[PDB]
Structures are given as structure tokens and as C-alpha cells.
Amino acid sequence: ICQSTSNHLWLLSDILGQGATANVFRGRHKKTGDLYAVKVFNNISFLRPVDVQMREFEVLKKLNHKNIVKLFAIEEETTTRHKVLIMEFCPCGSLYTVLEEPSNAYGLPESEFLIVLRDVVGGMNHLRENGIVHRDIKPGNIMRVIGEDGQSVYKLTDFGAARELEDDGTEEYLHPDMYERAVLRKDHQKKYGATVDLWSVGVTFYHAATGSLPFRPFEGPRRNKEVMYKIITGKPSGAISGVQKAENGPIDWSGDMPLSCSLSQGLQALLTPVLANILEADQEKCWGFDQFFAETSDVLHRMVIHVFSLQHMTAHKIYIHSYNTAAVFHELVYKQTKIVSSNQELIYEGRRLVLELGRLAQHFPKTTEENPIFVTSREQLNTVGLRYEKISLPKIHPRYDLDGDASMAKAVTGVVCYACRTASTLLLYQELMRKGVRWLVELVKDDYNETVHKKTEVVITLDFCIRNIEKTVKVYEKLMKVNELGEISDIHTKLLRLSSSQGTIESSLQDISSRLSPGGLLADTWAHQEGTHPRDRNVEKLQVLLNCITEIYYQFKKDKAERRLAYNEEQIHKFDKQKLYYHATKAMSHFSEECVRKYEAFKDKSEEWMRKMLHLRKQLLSLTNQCFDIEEEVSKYQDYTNELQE
Amino acid sequence: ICQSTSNHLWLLSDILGQGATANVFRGRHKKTGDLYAVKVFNNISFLRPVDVQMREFEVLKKLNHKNIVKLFAIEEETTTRHKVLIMEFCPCGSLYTVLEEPSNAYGLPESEFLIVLRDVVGGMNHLRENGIVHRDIKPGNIMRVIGEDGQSVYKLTDFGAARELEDDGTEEYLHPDMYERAVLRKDHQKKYGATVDLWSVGVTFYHAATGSLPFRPFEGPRRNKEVMYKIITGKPSGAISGVQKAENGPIDWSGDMPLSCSLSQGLQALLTPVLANILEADQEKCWGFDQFFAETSDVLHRMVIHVFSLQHMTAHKIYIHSYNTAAVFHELVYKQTKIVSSNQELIYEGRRLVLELGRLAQHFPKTTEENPIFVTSREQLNTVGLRYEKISLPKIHPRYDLDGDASMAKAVTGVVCYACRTASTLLLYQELMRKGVRWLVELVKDDYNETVHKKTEVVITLDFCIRNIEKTVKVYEKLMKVNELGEISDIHTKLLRLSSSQGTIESSLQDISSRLSPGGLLADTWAHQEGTHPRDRNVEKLQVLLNCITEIYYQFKKDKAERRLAYNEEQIHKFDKQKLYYHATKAMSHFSEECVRKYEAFKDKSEEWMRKMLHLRKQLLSLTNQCFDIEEEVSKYQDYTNELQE
Numbered sequence A, B: 001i002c003q004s005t006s007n008h009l010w011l012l013s014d015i016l017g018q019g020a021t022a023n024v025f026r027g028r029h030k031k032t033g034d035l036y037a038v039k040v041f042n043n044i045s046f047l048r049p050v051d052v053q054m055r056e057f058e059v060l061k062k063l064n065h066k067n068i069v070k071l072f073a074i075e076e077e078t079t080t081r082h083k084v085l086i087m088e089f090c091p092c093g094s095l096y097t098v099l100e101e102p103s104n105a106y107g108l109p110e111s112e113f114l115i116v117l118r119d120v121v122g123g124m125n126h127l128r129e130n131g132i133v134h135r136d137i138k139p140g141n142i143m144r145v146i147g148e149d150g151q152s153v154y155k156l157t158d159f160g161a162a163r164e165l166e167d168d169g170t171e172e173y174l175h176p177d178m179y180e181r182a183v184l185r186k187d188h189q190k191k192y193g194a195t196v197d198l199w200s201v202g203v204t205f206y207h208a209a210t211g212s213l214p215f216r217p218f219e220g221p222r223r224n225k226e227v228m229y230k231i232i233t234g235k236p237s238g239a240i241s242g243v244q245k246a247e248n249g250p251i252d253w254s255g256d257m258p259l260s261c262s263l264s265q266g267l268q269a270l271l272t273p274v275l276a277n278i279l280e281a282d283q284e285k286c287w288g289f290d291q292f293f294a295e296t297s298d299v300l301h302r303m304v305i306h307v308f309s310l311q312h313m314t315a316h317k318i319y320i321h322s323y324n325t326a327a328v329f330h331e332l333v334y335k336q337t338k339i340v341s342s343n344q345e346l347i348y349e350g351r352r353l354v355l356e357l358g359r360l361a362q363h364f365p366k367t368t369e370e371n372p373i374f375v376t377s378r379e380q381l382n383t384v385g386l387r388y389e390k391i392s393l394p395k396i397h398p399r400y401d402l403d404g405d406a407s408m409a410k411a412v413t414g415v416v417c418y419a420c421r422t423a424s425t426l427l428l429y430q431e432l433m434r435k436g437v438r439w440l441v442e443l444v445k446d447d448y449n450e451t452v453h454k455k456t457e458v459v460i461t462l463d464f465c466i467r468n469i470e471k472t473v474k475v476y477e478k479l480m481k482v483n484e485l486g487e488i489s490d491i492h493t494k495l496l497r498l499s500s501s502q503g504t505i506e507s508s509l510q511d512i513s514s515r516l517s518p519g520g521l522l523a524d525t526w527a528h529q530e531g532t533h534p535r536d537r538n539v540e541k542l543q544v545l546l547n548c549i550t551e552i553y554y555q556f557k558k559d560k561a562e563r564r565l566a567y568n569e570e571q572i573h574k575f576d577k578q579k580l581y582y583h584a585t586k587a588m589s590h591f592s593e594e595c596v597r598k599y600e601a602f603k604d605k606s607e608e609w610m611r612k613m614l615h616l617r618k619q620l621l622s623l624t625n626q627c628f629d630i631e632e633e634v635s636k637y638q639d640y641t642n643e644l645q646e
């Protein structure tokens, strides 16, 4: 059973989005066999002239952009003659489809979010610079296509259909006050349309970023409209999220992102301000478009430099503007890591990194987040570590309920997913920690060697001075046997008094070097005994359990779509439910008792090694400065004056 | 290609009303084969629990009333599982269907309108006394069924479906002000729902009564919403119709029904007040339901007495309350015919009608409008005649345009229909006029005969008096020869002086009677020479032409539905268009030059005969009173006193 046009055809089973004013199906071009999404305008629609439809056709074909779904044709159903719209097929689904994956239960991965921002604001810009302003933007009408390079492109749809077939042909029978309601409607195109879309856009961004809606009552926005209405309008500026955690409880207020959100500290820091005034409901403090575009463009144009604080044990994504200096870079690294520019010490691929007041970020060392710029202070601060939300498994209702079971499975799958992500990140922190530590000890060894070079360099100077004064005193006490032994003995005594200090440093250094040998004291062997390793394969164990859980979830989903099951099918469903319980509980017990525990042991040791290393560094600097002091003090003895002769 | 349930089945071609939120089809019960209207809830709908649907099922089955469409079942589509509603099939269509007939182009026939009132207010009452208030009532959702007795029953539908699937799942992405629009929506159930329906109801009543909407801009309510909105709210109280006849012209204002409306003067007089305050947009001067129900019930309970004014040549439907007196009846006949109670003279089936201060309307002579109560004054007033609108044929666009041709054909058919109605009514006025005239002359003859009976009755008295006094005077002038001749001669002379007057009346009467003979002067032969007759068959000639025109109209309608024609088909269409022109023009030329002309000749003669008859009546009354005078004057001579003797 299929519908058709001149050049297209589609099965009724091949339905897609399914709207009210129309429907969208997966169809094919009958000549090529290519795939297109067709939009049949249900069973009302057409009584409108061909002129308007062709001018709208024409104005809609000018829409040739990356972030807008292409409109290939306007056509007519064969045996029904009600309009169909030939548009681009997007096999991946929409942003809503992406968000419904339990892997994105707590927000999209950062790169994907950046892509979403870029795309949505792009389609918005291209839409506004031409005709039509997109009234409402949601995940539902933001389609996803996979580009030729593998990474997604998001496209705006549903904007031309601004048809007003609602009201309540009851037009010519209405009481004047329904017309006054229509007055209350038409006051929106004034300005509440060039700033009213931005609300939906902001809510969308928050949804994709956190994996949750910004404003949610006790058990759902729609499932309770009153307190929803009461929390939406009653919200003050700066606040980006209001949550009613309790039944008839109040509201939790936050101008920051949820702890569950794993978006980088920098991106988040650049994102919360835009969400603040895009979520306002009064006047010019709601920015308006142009400033929102300028700002979002500013954010999206930036390049990221990955830096890792070995002191706080924290990873960092620095959002620098590529064309801006290294000064503002140090000020950013400061802004996140609370260590001021002068204190900052950089490491890259086993060696120091040194840059100046105005080295632009373009020529900066290319950083991934497995090989970033390590950064350390000199000012003894505590470790901080990963900041994640501690999400526990929801209770698995001892029951039978295909819908409730599907939802529960979704929840559990999402939680276990967050667990895997967290474990992976923790392993990464431990790895970057180990490598960074090894580089740091190697580097301290470098500084040591340089110091020794200096010390010996001044020791040969002291030596030549002393044995030269002895040479002269000897070849004079024998030649002109006569005596001023006072002066030469004084300065000789001075040189010896320096030699003593030299000996002191020469032993103290062998001490400092002894505690950089394998032996112990400051060996990095703790990093080999503490924490978790890739060889432990905990991430992939968690991943196996997650795969089982996900299997059971998809099965429960199809069971839900089955409405009700057969006998054996039902029993299998229950068996699988308890199996899901065991998988989940096992996974989380492994996360806690194996990942977090050993991780925190590692972190603690890392603190109780960072203190040691910083101490030794202070010492080494101290006696290096000692060596310089000695050098310049000995430099005063190379051309000492002599008595005037006859 | 068909859809199905457990007990029902329907073709997709058997579609009916076709809505947006759903669709209605003509289907059958698979076991019985009976016809039912099924309502498939399109392709969204169901995500709502069975509990609510069963409580609504239950509360909707309590709706067992004459003016509400029965709901037989709630069921489920077989291979699609989206809800279907099993309801009563109404083969005749809706009130909209009835109104789209050109015979009702200028308003429904009166009995049908009364039926519509009764029905709509009945369904409204039964709806309000239970759950649900009908938000919007239009011809579109007022179905028509033909009862067992042939006369229609109208039923309200579309009231349970108060589903709110509009707004613009964009609920949880909306700006606070759309929610404030929702606030502006929910303020309607307050009271603007128990008085907001009455507007649509009133507009409906006006639509069915006049054949046109109450408030129409230059070329359509919908085709121009601005000035529509401006005329709806800007309307003052008492005004029931505002019409923008010109393009950008102002408005014509009327608190009365259009001249085209053929509803009786009495019904109209009872209808315009209800339409006035049901079409208000502020406070308690908008009546409210209970008073509207009480009033409409008052109107609908009344019985009609048909009366015909032979003086103004006008028909009248008197809406009396059956239980009320003949006094208020005379006051009604007064209110329409401007002749006061005492003046009114009634005739029924060839004879006088006489009734008293309190003869209730139940036992009144049963009146149709072909045999009514004729009524006449005694106070010489002009004829008025039929009051109809003078509607001319629209121009038949020398062109080719299937839609425009269909519309034009509809217009022409309606106009010619109004012409036939008007001609028929005119023939009726002439017939009632003739019959009434014949009865009136026969009745005047009655009065004459009675008068003559009286006059002779007193003549034998005068005679016996005179010849008795002569007898006595003679038998005394011979017996006691002696003389008082003065007295007897005086009274004898008096009796003779009376006899003279008697002679005068006796001749004047023969004159008055001579002009009631066939001969002439006041013969009713003008009614046989002037005007139009049933034997002329003008109504059925107009009817033949109307049938041709209607044939062409239906053909043009199907041509319009064909979108475009074949070659020969097109040529035939044009030929038929010009044929339609000739039919219409011929019909109207016959109406003017044959119906109205002779009618008005008749009417004029009727005036110039009414004056004569009233004059003769005044005379006859005068000399009847003369006869009474003479009688009582002669009664003073039967026992005259005599002289006292010894």
C-alpha cells in the first residue's frame, strides 16, 4: 500500500516524523531510486492559489545552505491531489534522536555540542538574513546528517509551514473576544519573534549540553503545567536552571551547569553567560539577535589548547582566540587553575615549554588531550581531581510493566554509561599524571646537571686562582726571599673560605642526586603501584556489562512497542530484567570498589609526592643561587691590584 | 481500499465531513449492514489512558436526546490501532447543506426555521443540564435527519472533542508570553463560555433566517479580517446586522431583518429582540443562558393563527400563546395591521366571526394560510400589499471559469427561486383577496336582508296603528256622531309623517340592493378580469425555467469539481451558460411583465372597490339605525292614554 507522485513514491509503513498538519514519509524518486523525505499535507490544506505556492517555492529554493534541509520539489499526489513536499532525507534522525541515546543521557560530548551550536546558529543566521524567522527551535526539528568526513552536520527544518489552521470554518461565528485573542496573537511579530525564538534556542542548547531540560517540575513539565508556568516567568536574570526536585517542594536555583555535565570548564565558562540573557523575558537585557550571533560566533571561532595541571590533577580546555597573545593565555590558565602567570611552568613532550608576551596561539604547540601542555605551579597547592556527579542506579521496580521497564532500562543504561565515561576519564587522569610525573623528574634531573656544570665551571676558577697565588708566593719567597705576606695570606684565606662552601654544596648536591636515583625517597614507583592501568582493562569490563545492559534495554524497548507479550516472551522479559539488575549492580560495584578507590589512592600519593618534589626543587634553586653567588664573588679575584713600583 | 474495526468497516472514498484533528466517513456495521458515521482520529491522538476514555464513553452515552447525535461505540482500527468513534449517520447532511440550496438562498422557510430553533435550543439545553457546554455552534456541525413523520430533526454534534492539540511538543520550549497567551485563553471558562456560545448561536440563527451572515465586509468575512474585526466589536446594542456594501465604504446598520427575509411579520417581531442581546459583547445585558432559554421556549411554544387583512391586502401570522385571551389576540392583530380592537371585523368560511374578552386561543377556529381569519376595518385605509425585496439577476460574466460559473449559476438559481416564491405568494394574495371579497359581498347581503326583515316588521306595526285609529275614528263618527278630532288627527298625521320616512328608506334600500346585484356598480367582476389566476399557470412556468436553470447549475457544479473539461465538454459548458442566461432573463421578464403587473392592477382595483363597499356599508348602517329609530318612535303609540269618563 503506497502513495505516489509523478517522480516519487512511498509506502505508508515508511512513515517518519508524523505531524498533525501533515505527515512525513521515507520515499524514493522513481527514476533514480534515491532516498527523499516526502511531506504529504494530510487531508485539508490546498485551496490556495498556484501563484503564492510558486513564489514560496521560489523563495524556498534560494535557501541553499549547509544548516537548512534542502527542498527538492513541490508535487502532487496521484490519486488524491493533495500537496506533497519533496525534501532531503536525513537517515540519522534528529537532535532528539541523538539525545535519546543513553550515552548522551547526561549531555552530548563536547565536540558534538560545538557542532550543534555552530550548526543551529548558522541555520538561524542564514534564515534571518533572508525571509522567515524560525519561530520555535527544538531537538525535534533539528535533523542530523553525516557529512563526507564522518562528523555530523545539523540542519534546521519546519519553518515555511507557518500555516494558521488552528484558531479553534468557525471564523465567521466567533465572539469579538476570540478576535481580541487574535489581537493578543498578532502582537508577537512586533519584536517578540526576533527574540522569542532565542528562548527555545537557549532551552535547546541547555538540553543538548546537560541532557536535561532547564525547567522541570516534580515529575515533568507537561505532566504539570501550573507550577511550570509559575517557575518559568518567576525566574530572575542570570539563572539558567530551575528544578523542582520534590513533589510539592520549592525550586532549586542554578546559574551554572549541573555537576553531571562533563563539558570542559572553559567552554562552560563561555556558555553560561550566553544562556543567562537568552533566557530572559523583558526588554533589551535579552540581548537581541545580532549580539547573540556575534557572541556565539566569538565562542565558536576559538581554538582549544589542552593543558593539564599536575598539581591539582585536573584537565583543562583553554578556549583562546588563536590571534590573541600568550599573555591572555596565561590569564586563562590562571582563570581556571588559580595559578598566576608568573608562577606557571609549562612542559611539552618531555621537555620545558617557554613562550613570550606575544606569541599568538596559531603557532602554539598542537595539543590533543592525550598529549597536552602540562602545567605546574611553584606555590604548594592541594590536588583537586575530577569533578563528577555521583549518580546512583535507580531502583528496579520488582514488577511487570513494559513501558515502565523500558524507561527503567533507559535510566540504568544511561547511568552505567556515565560510569564508563567517568572511569575512562579517571584512567586518563592517572595516565597523564604518570607521564607528566616522569617528565617532571627527568626535567629536575636536567636542572641538576646544568647546576653541576656551573659548579665545576666555578671550581676550576677557584682552583686556578688558589694554585696561582701559591705559585707566585712560592716563586717570590725563593727568588726575592724578602717579605707583605699579610695581604696574600688574607686573600688566600678568603679563597679557601670559599672552597669550604664549595665542598658543602658538592656534598649536598650528591645527596639531592641520590634521591633522584631509582633507589627511593622520590622515585616515581608509586605511580606503578598505585591506581589503575590500561592493562587492567576496567573500562572494557564496564563496557561489556554496559553492552549486556544495552542489549536488554533495546529488547525491553521493542517489548514496549509490542504492547503485550506472549507467555514465554513475558517470562524471558522478567528473567532479563533481573539479569539487568545483576549486570548494573556488578558494574557499579566494580566502578566504586575498583576504579574510584585505586584512583584516589593514586591521587593521594601524587599529593604526597608533589610536596616532596617541590621541596627538593626549592633546595636545588637555593644552592644554584649559591653557586652563582660564589661565581661572582670569585670573579672579584682575577685581576687584583698590585703595589706601585719604581 | 478500506479501513476496519471489529464490527465496522468503511471505504476511504466514503469520506464525509473531513476535519483536521480527525476525519468522518460513511461506514457500515459488518454484521447488520446498517449505516453509521465513523470518526477516525487521524494520525496522532492516542496516548491517553483507557480510564479517561471509558469515563468519557460513559458520560457520553448518558447523552440520549433527540437533538444530539447518538454515539454508538468507541472502537479501534484493525491494522493501525488509532481510535475510531461509531456515531449516527445523517444522510441529509447538515444545516450548512440545507442552506447551500438556492431555494434557501434568502433564508429558510418559516416552519423549517422554527424547527431549527426548537432543535438547536433543545440540544443546547440538554447539553448544559449535563456535562459539556457547546463552545461553537454553526450550520456545519448541526446535522439533519428526516424523522418518521417526514419533517426534519436537527442534531448537535462535535462537543466532546474539546482536545487542545494546537498551542502552536513545543510546550517545554516556549517563551513565558506564550504561556501568558495561555492565561489569556483559560480566562474563557470563567463566564465567557456560558455566554460566548450564544454569539455563534445567534449568528447561526441569523444565517438560517436571512440566508446570509450578519456581519460581512466588502467581499467576504474571511477574505478580509481587519474591517471584519473592526465591525464586530464596534457594534452597538440592538443592532443585529452590519453590512459593508461598498469596497472601502462604511457600514449599513440594521436592527431588523433584511427585506429579502420572508419570515412572517409576527415571528420576525418576536425574533429580532432575541438576536439583539444575544449579539452583545459585555456584561449582564447579554442576557445569559437561562433567560435566553426561557424566551426562546416562550416563542417556540406559541401556536399560530393565520389572519388576512383584506384592506391592506396583507397576510399575517399571529403568534399567540394558546392559553391567552382573545383580547391580546386583537392587540396582536392591532400591532401588525394598525387597526384597533374595536374596529376589527372577522370573517371565517363565508360567515362572520365573533369572539369575546376571554376566549382562549385553543378553541379558536383552526387556521391554515389558505383558509385564515379574514379581517377588515371600518376606517378607510390604503392597501399595502406584499413587501418583498426587488432582487435582480447578477451579470453573467462573458467568460469561461468553472468556479466562477458554478458560483454564478448558484446566484442565478437562487434569484429565480426567490422570483418563483414571490410569484406564488402574490397569486395567493390575489386568491385570498377574491374569496374574501366574495364572502364580504355575501355578508353585506346578509346584513341587508336582516335590515329588510326589521323594516317590514315595523311597517306592519305602522300599518296596524294607522288603520286601527282609522277604524276607531270611523266607528265613532258614525255611532256617537258627535265630536275631539284634533288629537286623533294630530297623532294620525304623526304616523303618516313616519310612513313617509318609511317610504324613503324603502326606495333607498332598493337602490342599495340594486348595486349588490350582478348588474354592476359594486360587482366583484373586476376580481375576474384583473390579476393573475391559477389557470394561468405562471408559477409552474417560472418553475419550468427554474428547473432548466437548476439543471445547468448542478452540471456547472460537477464541471467545477472536474477542475478542467474536455473539448466538447467545454463547448457544451459555454452553450449551456448562454442557455442559462436566456432561461433566467425570460423567467424574470415573465415575473415582471406578467406577475407583478397584473397583480398590481388587481390590488389597485381592490382599493378602488374597498372604498365603494365601505361607503355602501356606512349607508346601510345609517338607515338601519333609521329603522331602529322609527321602531322605537312607533312603540310610543301602542297604548296612548284616553280621557277619563263618568
Ligand SMILES: Cc1[nH]c(/C=C2\C(=O)Nc3ccccc32)c(C)c1CCC(=O)O
Residues within 6 Å of the ligand: A016, A017, A018, A024, A037, A069, A087, A088, A089, A090, A091, A092, A093, A094, A097, A143, A157, A158
Ligand atoms: C531518519 C528520520 N528522518 C526523519 C524525518 C526527516 C528526514 O529524514 N528529512 C526531513 C526533512 C524535513 C522534515 C523531516 C525530515 C525522522 C523523523 C527520522 C527518524 C527519527 C527516529 O527514528 O528517532
Ligand SMILES: Cc1[nH]c(/C=C2\C(=O)Nc3ccccc32)c(C)c1CCC(=O)O
Residues within 6 Å of the ligand: B016, B017, B018, B024, B037, B069, B087, B088, B089, B090, B091, B092, B093, B094, B097, B143, B157, B158
Ligand atoms: C450526509 C453527510 N453526513 C455527514 C457527516 C455526519 C453524519 O452523517 N453523521 C455524523 C455524526 C457526527 C459528525 C458528523 C456526521 C456529512 C458531512 C454529510 C454530507 C454533507 C454534504 O454533502 O453537504
